[PDB]
RNA sequence: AUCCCAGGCUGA
RNA sequence: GCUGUGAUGUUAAGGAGCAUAGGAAAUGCUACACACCUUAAUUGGUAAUGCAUUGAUAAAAAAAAAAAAAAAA
RNA sequence: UUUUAUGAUCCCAGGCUGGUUUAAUAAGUCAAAGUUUAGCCGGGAAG
RNA sequence: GGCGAGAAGGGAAGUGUGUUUCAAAGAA
RNA sequence: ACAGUUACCGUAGCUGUAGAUGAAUGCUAAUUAUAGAGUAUAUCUCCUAUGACACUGCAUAACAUAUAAAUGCUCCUUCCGCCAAAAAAAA
């Protein structure tokens, strides 16, 4: 039990143990491979509309894809989102991980 | 966010306090008749050895003190701090004041292997041949493994 | 590991004095618009880029609950593609298939001493 | 398996000492003896692949 | 030296080694694990980038990234390394575990401390089970008067 | 092919071993003035390097040669016996 | 005033040298270059043997005397070398046994580097030494220079200071130049089968040492 | 260079090109480079005389013929403009 | 040419 | 016995301080890391190095109980 | 006989190279040439 | 006695420096 | 890539505005946040909640990549770092 009546006591409690001024002390910041330098954020009304991540899938193959078991598999649209993958695409991704190689 | 940081730091503080208590309780005592000043004299601190001993209230404090505390000590130089650290570690590891090659051999000579100096039987010969077949004597040094097996 | 070291804490009323704030809501007080783009890249981005390939945080390691040893089944790898494009019609031919090596006139693989090119994997960007 | 398992540490502990060496060195030399072995193992695998 | 690895050996600079170059900025420092020659500048000429090592990271756990196949290849080639790199490779499992500073034989007080710590951990687990039998998030305990206590289990 | 030892030579040592030594006489660039300009205050600006055994002497001053240098190297000289 | 290297001098038994007009081969463009042959003059160092030790000794003829020529044989224990010790011994020290202590070497006591970290720690606390018995002796510059040969073996020191007990515990080499004869603290013991004619017993002291 | 120091060799008032009328406060100043150039004195009032040191920056006074530099106020012997807010 | 060599070999 | 002689020729291609010119071109450290040199040895050592001040010319200074992960819908 | 308007003869001035992010259907390598820890190189002398 | 030691060089050089493409074996 | 340049159209320059510097100058700040309420007076209002609603960039605060021009005078450099396994402390 400890009472932090002021900010000095809170700082004393939260302070890390002393470390030498020759070793790495500050953690290296995270860098996300899609916003390495800017961090866009919204700056224009509406400030809180819903933003959905979309990653294009396009056409990974342009050749006739036979059906896996019974599912068609062959593509039917260009608008498929890779962050919201459909049933048959997930089925293909699972079959690839099970291929014997 | 602040609460999560606070609780994690509280957990770490409790852990560190327990660890410090255990280390201080299980510190290795000095030999009979030695004090902090005696240890400083034996290590030959020289300058302000009595003052350093006065700063360090007990052998447990001296043994478990950190480099930060040693630096905080008034009048202690970098060389003196390094000397103290080295000798404290050597004593805790039992390589000092018995600092002699004969002492090292006497204290830390490995005991003989279980089957060392035993006459060879047919079972031993068969096991040795099986180990040789398994380890392909032609490659490298099979004996490193076969001797331990 | 956190639950293995799990501990029961005793939090009093005076220990939450600074866990609470004056403001009801939180928002970012500064925009993320960089005043000098090249200076920002040189000072705060480039020095931490020890490789030119873009790699995501790894998936967490799964440990058996009872023992704590790694599980035989682990999460799949998480690759990153710029703008979500995960294919190339004409991939460039790469020497890093046998890194730091070449083929001598005799027909054998031999080592090569050469300062690595820091931007080799970002040409083209992947 | 032997080199990277718990047998190497036990072999280091069981290495015999020679007069004039500290306990660490006698384990270091045995430890380096295992190192020369693992280096040879890596070379064989790399060459076969 | 086998004929393959001759280029890795420098007449002017020395034999190959596995070591660490400082990287980052003032304050925020990590290390790039590279294969270079002995007399090359630490942050200068090198032959390959084998990984990275960050002791201070936001997650609080030292991070070690390594190309395992490349580390094996350079060990086979004969690159030398120092105690810290040997220890990191031993922890990573790439090489057998090097002995501690004063040797394995010299550690008995530390084994006793480890055993005592394990026993105390088991005792605290038993106490936590006894607590689980009731699991009261909020309690009142006397000083004069009773104050509230929150039993957070982090 | 390049040379393993370059411009240095393996030569016997006073302790029974061997070591690498630079060539003699020194390979100098005489087309340029000595640097620093005050080098004469401490050195002999016209120092000469002779090759004499008993009564036989050789006049040999290494100098740069036209490219390609190849295995022979950048430096050469004439055969002059006294 | 400043402390600087003493001027170079030539050794006893040699002609003079002309010298050089600047300290070393890089002066002054590389001020931190140190020559391997530089004289060791700082405290805690031993001057090189036959290069900077035993300099030519000159004194005004007013103060010259016969004792002036016994300086090398009268050098103190820490400085006197094996040849200087041997010159004024029976049979030039031959047939006797010699061993060096090394506990009083100048570097172990004086200098800035005297106190430094050691791989084993600081000192807190019978011995098997190396014993040399000369057999062939020839002085090139009496008494400090000689070409000696003899038997090197492993002895057995003991409590008297220490005294040699078994000069031949292990047979070593039967003919070798003395080890560390260039300088150090040497002690000697006459052979067991000593003759009173050669090893003269001390003359009896006067009963009444009148002033 | 961003600006150069100079010595005022002449201080006078010149007539601006028409249709503008009035008097513009100008000085011929010998820069540190040795060149002599015409410099306008911006602001109301000044104390510059001959042999006065002034810091000179790039600034073109379109009225005065050939004037291509101005004087930095408050630096060297050129006091800042008074009654300015 | 004989100052040095903790460098060597030789002499019926 | 009485001057002297015995290798007795020592400081810039560097650093620091102070001035000159110029709009202007530079300051502190007890520095537990890396790297390097050395060694029989995590045996010993450093100031290359690493930290901090100013500079105003760059960032971070929003969001996830039990996790350190999570395009945070 | 050898060079020479594809610049001989013949002055003055300058070592070269790399640096990941990088908005706009301007990119899959920053796109004729702009860098910042670094890479390669840069005589000899105690006569 | 043994190893290491350039205040980490910009003082030379224009068809030069460097760059790009190659090549380099002891135990014969 | 937009605007302006005295009737209109075409040449043609010129003027302001972007970006990369971060080098000099002007004005300006700095030791970074001490402290912790209740009835904050009214109106309105089924997320009923000190909700609408309204001093806390206010915190474990942070503080970064490349550099070191020219002339003169004075002083300084001489015991550089390790190894005695450079035969040492020596069963």
TrEMBL record, chain A:
**What's the domain of life for this entry?**
Eukaryota
UniProt-recorded name of the protein: Uncharacterized protein
Organism equals Toxoplasma gondii
Task: Show which stretch of the intact protein is covered.
Answer: 144 to 244 of 419
From TrEMBL, chain B:
Q: Mind telling me what this protein is named?
A: Homeodomain-like containing protein
Highest rank taxon of the organism: Eukaryota
Species this protein is from: Toxoplasma gondii
Which part of the full protein does this chain span, and how long is the full protein?
A: 350 to 498 of 597
TrEMBL record, chain C:
> Which domain of life does the UniProt lineage start with?
Eukaryota
Q: Can you say what this protein is called?
A: Macro domain-containing protein
Q: Which residues of the full protein are shown?
A: 573 to 698 of 698
Coiled coil stretches, renumbered: none
From TrEMBL, chain G:
| Start and end residues of each stretch annotated as Disordered | 1-16
Q: Which domain of life is it from?
A: Eukaryota
* Protein's name in the database: Uncharacterized protein
In its UniProt entry, the species of origin is given as Toxoplasma gondii
The uppermost taxa in this organism's lineage are: Eukaryota, Sar, Alveolata, Apicomplexa, Conoidasida
């Amino acid at each position: 039990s400890v009472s932090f009546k002021n900010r000095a006591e809170w700082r004393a409690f939260m302070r890390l143990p002393p470390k030498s001024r020759v070793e790495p002390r500050r953690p290296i910041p995270r860098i996300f491979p899609w916003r390495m330098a800017h961090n866009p954020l919204p700056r224009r009304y509406p400030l809180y509309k819903h933003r959905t991540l979309f990653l294009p899938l396009s056409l990974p193959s342009y050749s006739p894809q036979p059906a896996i078991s019974g599912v068609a598999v062959a593509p039917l649209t260009i608008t498929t989102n890779a962050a919201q993958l459909p049933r048959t695409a997930l089925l293909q991704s699972a079959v690839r991980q099970l291929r014997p190689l | 966010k602040t609460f999560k940081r606070f609780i994690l730091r509280y957990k770490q503080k409790e852990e560190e306090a327990e660890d410090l208590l255990l280390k201080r309780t299980y510190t290795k005592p000095l030999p009979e008749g030695w004090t902090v000043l005696t240890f400083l004299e034996k290590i030959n601190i020289g300058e302000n050895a009595e003052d350093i001993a006065a700063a360090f209230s007990s052998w447990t404090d001296l043994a478990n003190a950190t480099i930060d505390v040693l630096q905080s000590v008034e009048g202690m130089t970098n060389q003196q701090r390094r000397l103290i650290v080295k000798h404290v570690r050597l004593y805790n590891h039992g390589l000092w004041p018995e600092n002699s090659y004969e002492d090292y051999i006497d204290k830390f000579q490995a005991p003989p292997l279980e089957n060392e100096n035993k006459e060879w039987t047919e079972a031993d010969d068969a096991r040795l041949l099986e180990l040789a077949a398994q380890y392909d004597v032609s490659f490298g040094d099979p004996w490193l493994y076969i001797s331990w097996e | 590991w956190s639950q293995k070291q799990r501990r029961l804490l005793d939090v009093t009323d005076g220990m939450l004095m600074f866990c609470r704030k004056h403001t009801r809501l939180s928002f970012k007080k500064h925009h993320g618009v960089i005043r000098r783009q090249k200076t920002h890249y040189f000072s705060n981005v480039r020095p931490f880029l020890w490789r030119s390939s873009r790699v995501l945080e790894p998936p967490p390691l799964l440990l058996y609950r009872h023992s704590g040893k790694p599980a035989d089944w682990q999460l799949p790898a998480r690759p990153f593609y710029r703008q979500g494009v995960s294919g190339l019609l004409f991939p460039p031919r790469l020497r890093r298939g046998f890194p730091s090596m070449r083929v001598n006139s005799k027909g054998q693989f031999v080592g090569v001493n050469k300062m690595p090119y820091i931007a080799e994997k970002a040409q083209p960007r992947l | 398996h032997f080199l990277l398992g718990p047998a190497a540490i036990e072999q280091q502990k069981a290495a015999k000492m020679q007069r004039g060496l500290t306990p660490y060195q006698t384990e270091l030399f045995m430890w380096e003896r295992q190192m020369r072995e693992i280096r040879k193992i890596y070379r064989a695998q790399y060459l076969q692949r | 030296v086998r004929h393959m690895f001759l280029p890795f050996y420098s007449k002017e600079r020395g034999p190959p080694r596995i070591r660490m170059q400082v990287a980052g900025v003032k304050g925020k420092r990590f290390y790039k694990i590279v294969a270079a020659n002995q007399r090359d500048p630490r942050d200068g000429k090198h032959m390959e980038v084998l990984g990275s090592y960050a002791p201070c990271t936001p997650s609080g756990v030292e991070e070690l990234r390594l190309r395992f196949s490349r580390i094996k290849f350079w060990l086979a080639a004969g690159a030398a390394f120092n105690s810290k790199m040997g220890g990191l490779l031993g922890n990573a499992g790439l090489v057998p575990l090097p002995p501690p500073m004063f040797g394995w034989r010299t550690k008995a007080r530390y084994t006793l401390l480890e055993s005592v710590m394990q026993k105390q951990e088991k005792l605290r687990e038993n106490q936590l089970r006894e607590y689980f039998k009731t699991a009261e998030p909020v309690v009142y305990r006397q000083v004069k008067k009773e104050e509230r206590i929150r039993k957070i289990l982090r | 092919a390049p040379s393993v030892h370059g411009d240095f030579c393996v030569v016997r040592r006073a302790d029974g071993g061997f070591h690498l030594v630079p060539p003699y006489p020194p390979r100098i660039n005489r087309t340029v003035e000595p640097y620093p300009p005050s080098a004469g205050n401490f050195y002999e600006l016209n120092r000469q390097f002779k090759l004499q055994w008993k009564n036989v002497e050789y006049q040999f001053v290494p100098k740069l040669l036209p490219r390609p240098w190849g295995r022979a190297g950048p430096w050469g000289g004439d055969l002059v016996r006294i | 005033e400043k402390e600087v290297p003493p001027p170079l001098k030539s050794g006893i038994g040699e002609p003079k040298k002309t010298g050089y007009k600047f300290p070393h081969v890089f002066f002054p463009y590389k001020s931190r270059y140190r020559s391997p042959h530089r004289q060791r003059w700082w405290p805690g160092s031993a001057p090189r043997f036959l290069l900077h030790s035993h300099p030519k000794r000159w004194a005004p003829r007013r103060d010259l005397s016969f004792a002036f020529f016994a300086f090398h044989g009268l050098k103190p224990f820490a400085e006197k070398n094996l040849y200087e010790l041997m010159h004024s011994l029976p049979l030039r020290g031959a047939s006797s046994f010699f061993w060096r202590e090394a506990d009083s070497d100048p570097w172990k006591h004086l200098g800035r580097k005297a106190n430094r970290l050691q791989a084993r720690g600081v000192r807190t606390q019978g011995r098997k030494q190396l014993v040399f018995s000369p057999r062939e002796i020839y002085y090139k510059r009496r008494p400090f220079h000689a070409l000696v040969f003899g038997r090197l073996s492993v002895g057995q020191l003991g409590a008297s200071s220490r005294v040699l007990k078994h000069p031949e515990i292990i047979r070593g080499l039967s003919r070798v130049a003395p080890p560390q004869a260039s300088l150090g603290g040497w002690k000697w013991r006459p052979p067991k089968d000593a003759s009173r004619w050669i090893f003269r017993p001390k003359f009896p002291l006067p009963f009444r040492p009148e002033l | 260079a961003p600006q150069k120091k100079g010595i005022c060799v002449k201080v006078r008032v010149q007539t601006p090109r028409k249709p503008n009328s009035g008097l513009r406060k100008v000085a011929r100043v010998r820069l540190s480079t040795g060149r002599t150039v015409l410099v306008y004195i911006p602001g109301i009032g000044h104390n510059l005389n001959v042999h006065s040191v002034v810091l000179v920056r790039g600034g073109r006074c379109k009225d005065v013929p050939g004037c291509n530099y101005k004087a930095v106020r408050g630096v060297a012997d050129l006091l800042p403009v008074k009654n300015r807010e």
